[PDB]
Every structure is written in structure tokens, then in C-alpha cells.
Amino acid sequence: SHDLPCLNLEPPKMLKLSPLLRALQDRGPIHRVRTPAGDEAWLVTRHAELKQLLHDERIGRTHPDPPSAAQYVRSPFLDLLISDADAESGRRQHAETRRLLTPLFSARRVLEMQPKVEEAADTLLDAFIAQGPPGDLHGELTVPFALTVLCEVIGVPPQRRAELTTLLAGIAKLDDREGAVRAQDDLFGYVAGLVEHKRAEPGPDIISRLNDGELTEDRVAHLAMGLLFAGLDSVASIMDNGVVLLAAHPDQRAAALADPDVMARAVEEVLRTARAGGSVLPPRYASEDMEFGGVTIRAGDLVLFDLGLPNFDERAFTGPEEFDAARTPNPHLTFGHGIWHCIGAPLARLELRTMFTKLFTRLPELRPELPVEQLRLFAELRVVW
Numbered sequence: 347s348h349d350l351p352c353l354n355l356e357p358p359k360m361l362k363l364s365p366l367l368r369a370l371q372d373r374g375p376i377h378r379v380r381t382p383a384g385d386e387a388w389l390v391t392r393h394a395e396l397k398q399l400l401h402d403e404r405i406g407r408t409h410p411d412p413p414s415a416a417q418y419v420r421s422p423f424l425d426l427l428i429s430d431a432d433a434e435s436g437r438r439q440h441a442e443t444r445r446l447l448t449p450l451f452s453a454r455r456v457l458e459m460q461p462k463v464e465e466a467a468d469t470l471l472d473a474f475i476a477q478g479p480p481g482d483l484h485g486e487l488t489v490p491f492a493l494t495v496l497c498e499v500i501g502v503p504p505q506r507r508a509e510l511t512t513l514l515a516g517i518a519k520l521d522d523r524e525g526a527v528r529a530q531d532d533l534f535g536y537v538a539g540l541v542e543h544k545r546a547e548p549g550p551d552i553i554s555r556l557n558d559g560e561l562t563e564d565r566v567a568h569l570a571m572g573l574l575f576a577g578l579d580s581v582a583s584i585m586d587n588g589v590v591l592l593a594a595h596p597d598q599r600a601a602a603l604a605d606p607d608v609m610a611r612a613v614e615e616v617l618r619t620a621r622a623g624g625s626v627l628p629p630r631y632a633s634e635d636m637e638f639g640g641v642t643i644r645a646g647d648l649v650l651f652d653l654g655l656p657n658f659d660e661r662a663f664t665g666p667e668e669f670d671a672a673r674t675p676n677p678h679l680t681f682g683h684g685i686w687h688c689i690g691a692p693l694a695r696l697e698l699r700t701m702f703t704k705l706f707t708r709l710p711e712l713r714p715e716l717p718v719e720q721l722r723l724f725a726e727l728r729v730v731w
């Protein structure tokens with residue numbers, strides 16, 4: 347019957363939404379679309395409306411029949427995110443997780459993380475530079491940096507790190523529902539052991555602090571594993587894309603390097619411009635019928651949160667296709683918003699400001715080996731300097 351527009355997985359161009367996504371954003375704030383998996387979904391295309399939906403408690407992770415729930419992509423890994431719970435349960439669990447995690451990232455606490463973040467970048471950059479160019483910025487710097495910072499902050503003693511790495515590759519390579527339940531189970535038991543160690547021997551770290559709050563071992567282990575998933579690929583991929591963006595815009599890179607305040611804004615601009623559409627948060631579903639934006643979203647419908655659409659909405663940014671390291675203000679939604687806002691954001695900002703500063707201070711000429719066109723077609727990111 348339908349002729350819904352069909353979204354696809356083609357990599358976006360640098361600083362430009364795809365023709366189809368510009369046409370949708372142009373046409374209206376909200377549309378019925380077909381996802382790359384072939385299911386129906388609502389795509390919200392504009393900054394104001396997405397922001398408002400991100401605060402709407404009628405959208406969440408529960409679905410009464412998860413196996414027939416619409417999906418953006420088939421992914422055994424993301425399937426485990428879809429709660430079977432009643433909607434109210436889902437909301438309470440979510441609010442309680444936010445209550446438990448938010449104190450861990452207070453101003454004072456993130457200040458206390460900063461010297462480990464500085465130290466980890468110096469150590470890893472020292473090693474990456476010693477190996478000489480060309481090097482794989484992804485596999486040899488940005489991923490290890492993000493993971494090291496996570497170890498330091500969550501409380502993974504150095505001796506246990508080799509196994510963590512391995513269990514994490516072991517969830518990265520997974521590809522069926524059995525293998526993905528099993529890989530989760532192994533990581534979980536590993537993490538429960540970390541929790542028991544820290545009960546015996548507290549540190550100034552997330553696991554000890556959650557222990558202190560009289561949470562049971564399962565609950566601490568679940569929170570710690572969630573933090574591992576939230577803080578790893580996200581950081582590495584914004585960092586990778588930032589190096590590409592900053593290498594490609596020499597005068598702004600120079601302005602960012604001359605003034606830490608410009609560097610702070612440059613980080614915000616990398617966050618805004620790292621992906622120009624096509625990356626969608628994990629699935630989220632209306633838990634009850636809702637009128638929104640001219641349509642009726644039905645209980646159980648898939649609603650897509652593509653944060654790159656708002657980030658390139660000319661209604662929210664002047665000249666959205668321009669990389670402006672000094673853009674101010676910069677209300678990007680790369681950390682989500684409302685009920686879905688990144689609790690690690692202050693830490694993520696710190697990792698990005700620290701690594702862009704040290705990379706481009708020590709290696710002023712650093713750039714990708716391939717030109718952007720070829721790069722677009724990261725598993726690896728080879729750079730020279």
C-alpha cells in the first residue's frame with residue numbers, strides 16, 4: 347500500500363546531510379519511514395521537536411512483544427536493550443539508574459578524574475608517537491585511551507585489564523542471539539569479581555562509591571558494565587571524527603590551539619558535526635498512543651532518534667554545514683537531552699579537550715592518510731604526521 351521513504355545505511359558525507367534526509371527535514375518535523383531493516387518507524391527531523399520528544403515519558407525501552415517490535419537495524423546486541431517490562435516499570439528502573447549514576451559525575455568528582463585522564467593520554471600518546479607514522483589512530487590510540495580512562499574511573503586494577511579488553515572484543519565480534527547473551531554473561535561475571543574485590547579494598551572510583559551506597563553486587567555490576575558500554579565506542583568515534591574534522595580545517599585548528607576557550611568550543615563543534623545523519627540511538631517505542639506534530643504515534647511504534655538531524659537543522663544553527671571551531675552558542679544534541687541525557691558528558695568533554703589539545707600540540711601536521719572521499723568508504727583510521 348504505502349510508499350514510505352526508505353532510510354539506508356550509506357555513510358554520510360562530511361558536514362552535509364544526505365539528499366533524502368535534507369528532503370525530509372525540509373518537508374516537515376515528523377514522518378512515517380521505512381528503516382534499513384524494513385520496518386515502519388517515526389523519524390523526527392528537526393531540533394525543536396526532537397528535543398521535546400527526548401523529554402516525553404511516553405517513549406521508552408519497553409515493548410509488550412519485543413520479538414515483533416519494529417527495528418532500525420537487526421542487531422542481537424541492541425535486542426538485549428528492549429525491556430519486556432510494563433511501561434511504568436521501565437520508567438521507574440530508568441529514573442533509578444539516573445539517580446544512582448548522576449552523583450558519580452558531579453563537578454568535584456569529574457575534577458578528581460581529570461589527572462587520570464591527563465596521565466592516560468600522555469602515556470598512550472608517548473607510545474603511539476614512538477611507533478612512528480603512519481599509525482592507526484583508532485586501534486592504537488583513541489580506543490585504548492577511552493578504555494584506559496574507563497578503567498581508571500570505574501576501578502579496574504591494571505592486572506585485570508587484559509581480560510577486560512578480551513571480553514570486550516568478545517562482545518564486539520558476536521553476531522547471533524545465543525553468542526550475544528553468552529558474551530554478556532561472561533563480562534558480567536568478570537565485572538562481579540571486580541565488584542567483590544573493591545568491597546574488600548575500596549578506591550576513589552565508581553565501583554567503590556556504588557558499593558558505599560549499599561547497592562547489591564548484581565546492581566553495581568550492571569551499572570559498571572552499562573558504563574563500559576556507554577563510554578567506550580562513543581568517545582573513540584567522536585575523537586576519530588574530530589581528528590578528521592580538525593585536520594581538514596587548519597585555520598580553526600590553529601585558533602583552537604591558541605586559546606583553550608576556543609578549544610572548548612571546538613570540542614562542542616566536533617560533537618555537533620561528527621556525524622551528519624544516519625546514526626540512530628537504540629530503539630525506543632511509544633508506550634501509549636500520542637498525538638505529536640500532526641500525527642498519532644501508536645502504542646508500540648518505533649520512534650527514531652537521529653541526533654545528526656537536529657545537529658544540522660538550519661532552524662537551530664546558522665550555517666549548519668560550516669565547521670566553526672568558535673561557534674557560539676552551540677545547542678547540539680550529541681549528548682541527547684531530557685530523559686535520555688548523557689550522564690558521562692562532563693567526562694567525555696574532558697577526554698576530547700585533552701586528547702585534541704595534546705595530539706595537535708605535539709603533532710601539528712597530523713592528518714588522515716586517505717583523503718576524506720576514500721575514508722567515507724572507523725575500523726581503522728591511519729594517520730601520518
Ligand code: HEM
Pocket residue numbers: 444447572573576577578580581582584627628680681682685686687688689690691693694
Ligand atoms: C564520547 C562521547 C559520548 C557521547 C557522544 C555520548 C552520548 C550519549 C547519548 C546520546 C546518550 C543517550 C543514549 C540513548 O538513550 O540511546 C548517552 C547516555 C549515557 N551516557 Fe553517554 N555519551 C558519551 C560518552 C559517555 C561516557 C564517557 C560515559 C561515562 C563513562 C557515558 C555515560 C552515559 C550514561 C550512564 C548514559 C545513560 C543515561 C540515561 O539513559 O538516562 N557516556 N550518552
